[model samples]
Target: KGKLPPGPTPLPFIGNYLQLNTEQMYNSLMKISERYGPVFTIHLGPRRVVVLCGHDAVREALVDQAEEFSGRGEQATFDWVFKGYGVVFSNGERAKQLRRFSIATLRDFGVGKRGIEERIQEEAGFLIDALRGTGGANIDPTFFLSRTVSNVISSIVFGDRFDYKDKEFLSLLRMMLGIFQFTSTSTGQLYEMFSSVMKHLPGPQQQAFQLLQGLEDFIAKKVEHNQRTLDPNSPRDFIDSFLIRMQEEEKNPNTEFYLKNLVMTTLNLFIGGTETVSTTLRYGFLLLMKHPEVEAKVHEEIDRVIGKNRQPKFEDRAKMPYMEAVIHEIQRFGDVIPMSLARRVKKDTKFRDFFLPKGTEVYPMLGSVLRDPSFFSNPQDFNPQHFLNEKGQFKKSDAFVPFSIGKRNCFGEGLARMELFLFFTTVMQNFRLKSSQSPKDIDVSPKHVGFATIPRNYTMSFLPRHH
Candidate 1:
């Protein structure tokens, strides 16, 4: 309240709790921006967070002053477990080392050095079979999508893929889904708002802790196994590479390469790569089913560009701009990661009018920029024309940053795009989505709205298309 930007004042230990108590914390934050200008503060307990809303405010802070505003903010949701160790949660030198290695390793795996395109294609084949196994009956695609997506992450992290029916594989999927599901819950909200007291109390947060513990145990065992059978020259996957790096940096006392970073960073990748991409596809299908006309255009593009003879190639994106626009629109409207993971200022600096202290957490919301009326023509509607130009070619939008922006933007973005393109096109090529309810009656709005904007649960059948 002193020299900080205008915002709601917090009382003692209870800071802005009542202000953000709604299920639509994402909406509430944006709603605040409606009244108190785009750039403002909101107190989370004792600390204050400057939330940057709309494209202009968010872009200027994140893009213009990228480095100064790039620190990974303290997130009560994850900090309890991460303890500032992993790439997603770490800061300073630790983040630099871990993030660089991860980006390079994942890029090498995804960007064709080891042929992740081939790997993703085979997994796509397995998925088409699974849908065909449904035998024209309506089935919930939740676990199905989660399983396939996590398997891609598994190959990258563990150098192996688990059978869909494997109990442990199923368990891992359940835990990952559970952790994300609970993030929007009342207990989870309470934990995030006032984790100070909630940590001592009992609720679903405890179960989340248990889930993380189980996830940690699972990764820990894998790390141990990788340590034993590690080949310095022939790195099998992400874990093996980290092990090799650790040995190389063994003498450096300050090396970020270590057991704890590996495990949590592995946790970061597995968790990072799993739900976001799959959920986007899940909503992609849901969007197609709701809008049959749009679905028809996507199918037309699929037939014209990537005919029924073979699977989709990432190389096919250039010729199929409509399909590309549709996929990008799906992510834009879906907004799975509505509020990008929070960020803190790297140093005490001037932003707009206020002098932000070195550690002030800032939420550069992806939802705002995506839905901002300034950038998108139909900011509320599901229209691919937003990403299409007058010439009917795929057009880029500076504000269409669903993966967020800046140096710390989702590093897994490239790999996620590859998976999205291949998985989505392959499925659309083989099947016409069918639901018992008419497309007119269907509401494609997200039900669970918190950290993630989850689509309403529905059942659909994948009817094999006639050539």
Candidate 2:
């Protein structure tokens, strides 16, 4: 092998694979790079993995040479966990075509909708109702939040929504939870290591595999169900448009527009959209609780702008900079999606003196950049000021990569931005969230869940914010 960039020495087949835990892969990489240097390589089993562990290294790999890093790992194993039909695992020409179509279609579906925020407001009201139904008490807000957020994507994708109590709805959520919980466990690594052997065995991985299958089954049924009921004259959601495209493309031999792609793509929206935004909100409440003064200022902004009488709409985003900055800070501090989705070097590229050979598996470390002290004046603390100008309006930063950047940047970013703003401010507008215990008792720390990051269980009570 051409002199590989520096990293901890890999021990043959085992590699550093055993070293990674669900809680701290990116953190560990940052620590490793302090000693070994940024452009380094490791092995995930037999697969060669190169890591770009700092701001400069990641920016160099992802932005400086975008096309050279187009290839990503197969999500078939992820298929065993999420069974998504979308571009998460797709590569080559198929990935390119689908991603292009998806970005276009998503925008067409009202990504920055004036009406779209109304839908989110409606969902936020629905979620508030769910919380109120629980009385003024502590509750694990994740499940309901996951449903409301997922359904927004569901409306955009499938043009349908499920009642939170619907059996199928609960089943899908449970499946997602199982996969998240299992992947957060070491059992997930074993499954990846011996995916074949684990297929026949009994373990958390096996249970999670069944859940993945169930998710696919759920999506397949939804596609068929939508096909029968959809109004073709006016397409309502993504599946409707995709179904129309699939019919048209069936006549064309080159189309990858098949049943598998539709179902998997829908699956991607539900699984990725739900868990990510909900997890951030989960942590946001916890962090806000911890920093009462910060939370009070955010609440004050929501009350002043969106007001106590009504919910925050997406349109109000431009009007409510303080509230907006707080939401952006939540994402920046949470900085979910810790590992840059692994990209294979499609062509030879150089970062400084390091030559990244074609086909080398390149990993970008986003978590490093998110918390890099050089980029933020106060990296370790929870500060909304990072995204605020001296005038106190929301500002953007090169280091904010929650949805990531370049070619593989998240397609759902527009939708995600809307959800974060509307849902968060709406909740703030409706309820002043306070922990049953003191803020000191709340867990402000994160609980790592493999590919995704989430917070540990912490309870908060939301008393209705009366005008």
Candidate 3:
């Protein structure tokens, strides 16, 4: 037998399902790492996962052995529909081609440039107006926030933004939010553990399947629209560019620029680009409400750097160290995507004396690195000082890996970062976040803790502040 890292014995088809906790899944993994070493194997259903905990093990594999562990692991729940075509979930050469094309295409459309920053600033204006409509009345942030975040990605991908009241846009958002919550449910976990059997039956995964189908259908229309109006030399948006590529490589039998790739990759951007960033903003706002002192300090920084007369720019983040610190702290505390989308090994590899054959699915426990006591002074508390130095300037921590590490890391990181800085600072510049509960009474703990950490639905009014 291969020398795999030691773990609790698995029980037949269920694997180590009895030994795991689904709700606090990442926490459960960390608990297991205490008994087993940092590198250990546990099975989820028939799937064997080697979990890497803390900064040391995670950095070593994900950072050091980046190429070996760059493969996107199996997403059993979505495999029925995705079928391994998109950039996010696809592995090997197909993944590489899509990623290379995507990164370049995104760059062309101003994802990481000043162009996208303006888009975010423009959207933040709409967001602030929406907040002002609250008029100190408690409003749940789920819709408005997701809408704004979605619109930012939409600008680059679809080449336009939808109105805040657009029914079609809102409907698509509803579907995404449903799928997001559904993935964390008991049925979702069951589907992941037993997809082979569950896929044959009618269940919530079926409902999720319908939603994904709906999403693809919408994308199909957009792709067709681009095809009809496409100027060979003057392509617009991701769909148009992909259509052009499809034309270019029509004769090549091995080309990956087909209809399915176009649809799924667009879908990946639409879904991946929206949810995580929006959730982080929601969590950040909640944390700000929980810590009024920190909120006041951020306010002081905003007023000092970006006065109320002008909109906040991405450049302003450089001067606003305190705000930067708080944002980093919020990301650290929030840990939105707790257990990152899984990664796998490309080939048979030796990791820290353990012989892991190719295709071993890996869970680099982000919760451990984020909350590692060796890196963070008070891992349990919500303190911005973790990212700030003794002189109160912004400091970088190697342990701060919210976007994750290496080749298979988040694709929309630059776009997301720009959005976070612009939207967060702009909102702070305009309104003071207020809720019915006092600072101490406000809860910062995540409401749902499955696939991603979902913040509690809290109603907070953005009270207009005087210059």
Candidate 4:
């Protein structure tokens, strides 16, 4: 066996538990990367985690040595919340089946394809009109933008879209996102770490857990209602597809189409597919406001390519290369979803020089890879040209794996791409977004979020390019 890489000393029972700062895990990992080089180890409970940092190490682990790192580590919290229903947390046959089913269902329904693009464009048009109603006044665009994007998911799943002013829907979405945020913080970490103790006490975390339960209950009711009302011959949305598959599988136990898997898969798509894209758009707008030249360049591209008279479509993406590059750079530069879901070593594996035994927790840091100096010229700069070569065409880089990589990459990668393109270009087409006022100071520093990185909450004026 090769020598294990160096890391912080481990303690008994808890291992390096003291080292874990749940809220600042990303920053802590960054510090560790600076000290120990790219490839290093850290202990979580009794588990030894080998964190693959930098582009080369990340690529070597995910692309070249994927088989050695195929297993997704046990998601204790996810399993408890989802009860092993969906693709994100399930294992073995269950996980594979859920992934296959989701991909197939999404494709069939025009989710990532051209038809899906049309739907997002339609939604964006509605959003532009709504933003216009604000009449260039400084407004909190978060709820409207998020609602509009979330509705795209709703349309896909339930074949219905939400009006941005819908208070109940907006409340539910915010609370859901807030619940996720709070649960991943010190409050939730304490609960998870001391579940044996915390379970016995009544507190806020438990209340948040109840809120999550309520959310699931709401989903269940919607599913039941749709199943009762919808026709089997014409499968409308994802829920119906799952329903049909469930019946088909019940007749044959060999099928992986089970109830729990269906709910979990839907939740995964709902959570991953919504929070991330909406959050990205929220920051994207703020960034565009922060950089008018960048914003102007984007608008000029939009005007030249699609023109203001017509709404933008997916096929138009090819023609709007500058805009596409901008989107890529935004996702890459901000580098949301930094630390992806963990992967467990299914069997004993050896990297170039390190031997990792079976069941070791392996986390390939996406932020590390995204900002690796060797791969990206100015890794920290918010430059769209990073994705464009000398030819002025968008070029895909190995380091731009914002969706992570390998067998367990994001199931909704296609949807994420479409949503980002539609929402970003659409907003640019309508608004010359900029800060409401100078920050009382010139502050363009990056703000950090544990689960996802985003720009600070800054307001902007959506001056209509034409009017």
By TM-score, is 1 or 4 better?
Answer: 1
Q: Candidate 4: worst 10 consecutive residues by lDDT?
A: 439-448
| Model 3: lDDT to the true structure | 0.86
TM-scores vs. true structure, each candidate: 0.97, 0.93, 0.97, 0.93
What 10-residue stretch in candidate 2 is worst by lDDT?
Answer: 75-84
Candidates 1 and 2: which is better by TM-score? 1
User: lDDT: which is higher, 2 or 3?
Assistant: 3
Give lDDT: candidate 1, residue 325. Answer: 96
Alpha-carbon local distance difference test for all models: 0.87, 0.76, 0.86, 0.76
Question: What's the CA error at residue 393 for candidate 2, in Å?
Answer: 2.9
Which lDDT tens digits does candidate 3 get at residues 216-331?
Answer: 88988888888888898987788788888899999999998898999999999998899888889989999999888898999899888877889888888889889999989989
C-alpha lDDT of residue 211 in model 2 = 86
Misplaced by over 4 Å in model 4 are 2-4, 74-77, 183-204, 439-448
Instruction: Choose 2 or 4, whichever is better by TM-score.
Output: 2
- Stretches off by above 4 angstroms in model 2 are 18-23, 74-76, 81-85, 189-200, 230-232
Candidate 4 lDDT over 342-429, as tens digits, reads: 7877788888688888878887889888887887899877788888989889888888888999888886888888888877887788
RMSD of 3: 1.3
Local error of candidate 3 at residue 369 (angstroms): 0.9
Candidate 4 lDDT score relative to the true structure: 0.76
